Write an enzyme that holds these catalytic residues in place. Structure first.
Site, PDB file in Angstrom:
ATOM      1  N   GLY A  48      11.711 -18.896 -29.781  1.00 50.07           N
ATOM      2  CA  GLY A  48      12.326 -18.117 -28.721  1.00 50.07           C
ATOM      3  C   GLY A  48      13.311 -18.922 -27.891  1.00 50.07           C
ATOM      4  O   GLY A  48      14.143 -18.352 -27.181  1.00 50.07           O
TER       5      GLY A  48
ATOM      6  N   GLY B  80      18.845 -21.495 -29.874  1.00 51.67           N
ATOM      7  CA  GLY B  80      20.139 -21.089 -29.362  1.00 51.67           C
ATOM      8  C   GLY B  80      20.329 -21.540 -27.923  1.00 51.67           C
ATOM      9  O   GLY B  80      21.446 -21.529 -27.413  1.00 51.67           O
TER      10      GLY B  80
HETATM   11  C1  LIG Z   1      14.041 -20.497 -32.329  1.00 49.48           C
HETATM   12  O1  LIG Z   1      13.655 -20.262 -30.979  1.00 49.48           O
HETATM   13  C2  LIG Z   1      14.018 -19.194 -33.141  1.00 49.48           C
HETATM   14  N1  LIG Z   1      14.619 -19.117 -34.273  1.00 49.48           N
HETATM   15  C3  LIG Z   1      14.461 -17.849 -34.822  1.00 49.48           C
HETATM   16  C4  LIG Z   1      13.707 -17.010 -34.012  1.00 49.48           C
HETATM   17  S1  LIG Z   1      13.198 -17.784 -32.582  1.00 49.48           S
HETATM   18  C5  LIG Z   1      13.082 -21.593 -32.843  1.00 49.48           C
HETATM   19  C6  LIG Z   1      13.107 -22.930 -32.055  1.00 49.48           C
HETATM   20  C7  LIG Z   1      12.119 -23.992 -32.555  1.00 49.48           C
HETATM   21  C8  LIG Z   1      12.256 -25.274 -31.750  1.00 49.48           C
HETATM   22  N2  LIG Z   1      11.252 -26.229 -32.246  1.00 49.48           N
HETATM   23  C9  LIG Z   1      11.056 -27.475 -31.789  1.00 49.48           C
HETATM   24  N3  LIG Z   1      11.818 -27.965 -30.799  1.00 49.48           N
HETATM   25  N4  LIG Z   1      10.084 -28.223 -32.328  1.00 49.48           N
HETATM   26  N5  LIG Z   1      13.545 -21.977 -34.186  1.00 49.48           N
HETATM   27  C10 LIG Z   1      12.827 -21.849 -35.317  1.00 49.48           C
HETATM   28  O2  LIG Z   1      11.689 -21.383 -35.332  1.00 49.48           O
HETATM   29  C11 LIG Z   1      13.479 -22.330 -36.618  1.00 49.48           C
HETATM   30  N6  LIG Z   1      12.442 -22.986 -37.435  1.00 49.48           N
HETATM   31  C12 LIG Z   1      11.699 -24.060 -37.085  1.00 49.48           C
HETATM   32  N7  LIG Z   1      10.700 -24.526 -38.146  1.00 49.48           N
HETATM   33  O3  LIG Z   1      11.801 -24.637 -36.000  1.00 49.48           O
HETATM   34  C13 LIG Z   1      14.128 -21.148 -37.387  1.00 49.48           C
HETATM   35  C14 LIG Z   1      15.095 -21.673 -38.459  1.00 49.48           C
HETATM   36  C15 LIG Z   1      13.082 -20.243 -38.084  1.00 49.48           C
END
Ligand SMILES: *[C@@](O)(c1nccs1)[C@H](CCCNC(=N)N)NC(=O)[C@@H](NC(N)=O)C(C)C
Length: 237
Positions: A186, A189
């Protein structure tokens, strides 16, 4: 945001919340105001999105509860995805939203400066990640915008934590060796703002990571300074 705290209203005036009206209005991803008609965000946020017509950008928001049927928003005229982007974990996770109308700058909503190519030597020591994302792996979108201060880690260090991936110089990572504070689902971006010389810079865009706030697993962000030329090309009509 895992391990963070509630933000003060107007603290992060470049922070916006991307909403989707399909099926029912809801928080999709984060984003940053970088110009009067421009939001910078993640490309992977638009997976499954066939039209910008289902998108709504809300600025000047602290609590999701401020958003109702009668709350003003910016329509999205065009989604611009980087031509080389294939998947967050592959890099190039960057996109521009051209708004249907212009954002009227104010204390609650103003643009964040992009880093300059000269600043690629700067050692940012005051960096924050913000968003309405999960507070934990199996959580839900948060009402109040969260903030967490997180140290940057060298690309060489990051690569060590992701031996199955390729951490390119177009990526930037941040996190504590022991974990505890990180972006999560969430927050994608959202901006990785780093205060340098009394000036906030958009250093990164929240992209991906293995889980959230895990030890030896720093969050991976798009390295914005590497896209200044691309942003200028797509932002110029
Ligand atoms: C994003 O908020 C989203 N992307 C798609 C829907 S919500 C996620 C942020 C994750 C940040 N993680 C961290 N700092 N450890 N992004 C994701 O979930 C991405 N995948 C992963 N495995 O983080 C997305 C490519 C699915």
């Amino acid at each position: 945001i895992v391990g963070g705290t509630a933000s003060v209203r107007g603290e992060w005036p470049w922070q916006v919340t991307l909403h989707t009206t399909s099926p029912t209005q809801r928080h999709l991803c984060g984003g940053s105001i970088i110009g009067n008609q421009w939001i910078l965000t993640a490309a992977h946020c638009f997976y499954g999105v066939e039209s910008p017509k289902i998108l709504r950008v809300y600025s000047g928001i602290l609590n999701q509860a401020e958003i109702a049927e009668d709350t003003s928003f910016f329509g999205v005229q065009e989604i611009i995805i980087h031509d080389q982007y294939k998947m967050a974990e592959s890099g190039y996770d960057i996109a521009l939203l051209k708004l249907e109308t212009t954002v009227n700058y104010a204390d609650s909503q103003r643009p964040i400066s992009l880093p300059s190519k000269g600043d690629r030597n700067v050692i940012y020591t005051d960096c924050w990640v913000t968003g309405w994302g999960y507070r934990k792996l199996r959580d839900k979108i948060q009402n109040t915008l969260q903030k967490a201060k997180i140290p940057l880690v060298t690309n060489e260090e990051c690569q060590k934590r992701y031996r199955g991936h390729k951490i390119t110089h177009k990526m930037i990572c941040a996190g504590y060796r022991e974990g505890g504070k990180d972006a999560c689902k969430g927050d994608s971006g959202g901006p990785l703002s780093c205060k340098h010389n009394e000036v906030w810079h958009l250093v990164g865009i929240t992209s991906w990571g293995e889980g959230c706030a895990q030890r030896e697993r720093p969050g991976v962000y798009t390295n914005v300074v590497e896209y200044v030329d691309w942003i200028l090309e797509k932002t110029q009509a």
